[PDB]
Specification:
Number of strands of chain B: 3
Protein name (chain A): Guanine-N7 methyltransferase nsp14
Shape of chain A: globular
CATH class of the domain at 74-119 and 136-284 in chain A: Alpha Beta
Distance between the termini of chain B: 53 Å
Binding site for Zn(2+) 14 (chain A): 205, 208, 224, 227
Shape of chain B: globular
Strand order of the largest sheet of chain B: 1-3-2
Largest interface: A-B, 63 and 55 residues
Helix content of chain A: 10-25%
Largest sheet of chain A: 6 strands, mixed
Oligomer: heterodimer
Active site (chain A): 88, 90, 189, 266, 271
Strand content of chain A: 15-25%
Subcellular location (chain A): Host cytoplasm; Host endoplasmic reticulum
Radius of gyration of chain B: 15 Å
Structural class of chain A: alpha+beta
Subunit structure (chain A): Interacts (via N-terminus) with DDX1. Interacts with nsp10.
Distance between the termini of chain A: 43 Å
Bound molecules: 1-methylpyrrole-2-carboxamide, magnesium ion, zinc ion
Number of strands of chain A: 15
CATH topology of the domain at 74-119 and 136-284 in chain A: Nucleotidyltransferase, domain 5
Order of helices and strands of chain A: EEEHEEEEEEHHEHEEEEEHH
Chain lengths: 285, 131
Amino acid sequence: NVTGLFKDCSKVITGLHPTQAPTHLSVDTKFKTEGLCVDIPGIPKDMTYRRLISMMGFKMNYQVNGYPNMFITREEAIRHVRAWIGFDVEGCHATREAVGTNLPLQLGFSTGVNLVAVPTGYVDTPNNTDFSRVSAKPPPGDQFKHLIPLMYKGLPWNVVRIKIVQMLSDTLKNLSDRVVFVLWAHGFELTSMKYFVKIGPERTCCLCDRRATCFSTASDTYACWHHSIGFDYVYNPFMIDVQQWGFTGNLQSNHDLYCQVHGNAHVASCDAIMTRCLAVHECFV
Amino acid sequence: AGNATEVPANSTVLSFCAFAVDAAKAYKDYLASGGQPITNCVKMLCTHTGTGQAITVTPEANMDQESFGGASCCLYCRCHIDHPNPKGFCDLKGKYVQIPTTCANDPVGFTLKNTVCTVCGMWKGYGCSCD
Ligand SMILES: Cn1cccc1C(N)=O
Ligand SMILES: [Mg+2]
Ligand SMILES: [Zn+2]
Ligand SMILES: [Zn+2]
Ligand SMILES: [Zn+2]
Ligand SMILES: [Zn+2]
């Protein structure tokens, strides 16, 4: 049995040399024998490869003392309804040098904000993993023809994650000591969170006694929503998947049963608005 | 399309360490909370008549060690995250690591917690001859 998490998306037929493969599964077939690997002097390592690694398939079910859980129960999410932010990501497909994974393209929030990012992937090399721009194409079809211009209007992820932190901080500083991302089919949103979320034990703000909701890589410091100017990461966020509440149809058909004032403009923020709207009607009526 | 690199047994630990601010502390805390060590490492079939050196260009396991492909023993390589040194480059990827047989159940944890003697090339506390 295998997972799709960290799936190698390069088009190279051969696997990796035993010294360079992250796992036994990704070692080239030539070196495999008796459930183990052999070193073959004369078959050298590859010193120029670029292998796009998939970030699709994360599982946040860790049970570690002192580390809060990202995914919360419906009852805990209800208690923190002031912290609710609907979140949806429209993606694009890896192309040319890689195939098999989706990259964040348009990030939508229930605040009405849409942020367009440069298609970026985690590319394995002989020395490390390079977080760099990758070739990508908008998904095949006409329900996604609005994503074609967005392929050239994207911002680098270092700017995108500062903008998310600023938007969340301005929205939530007077509402909650937290963020609860309200999702519908969380898979790709969780993948996208890898790009702007950090987790760890509960910390306090550098400038006050409130719990830390933001983290800065530049200074190795933490801040609440009031003192997060310049911060690039969302620290210890919470989230829930509304799809898993027993709904049968798609997002729009379930949202439309209770609400007639949020038409589907087929954009990331619209799906995020509908997700939070549906969660409110289902939880409080 | 594409080729799987991982098994489901590693999903939880790798997802946890992939999102952590401090991945090394996250893995040590994961193990301390009863978590299972990272599996699916590159274990080598070797003669066990090697030098016993810790990090080598070819497998050098002696009769008290197992040899592994270095990238597969590196938490940062396994999680596809930044490496903690200033140049952001790996010292294990591209080499073979010799792990004592007693600690072969957790190659990733062994390399995270131990140091190689710069004088004799053996692991400190596990074959390092000098005092
Ligand atoms: C199985 N596998 C995993 C990563 C690359 C490969 C390959 N091309 O053999
Ligand atoms: Mg969706
Ligand atoms: Zn503060
Ligand atoms: Zn609505
Ligand atoms: Zn490494
Ligand atoms: Zn020594």
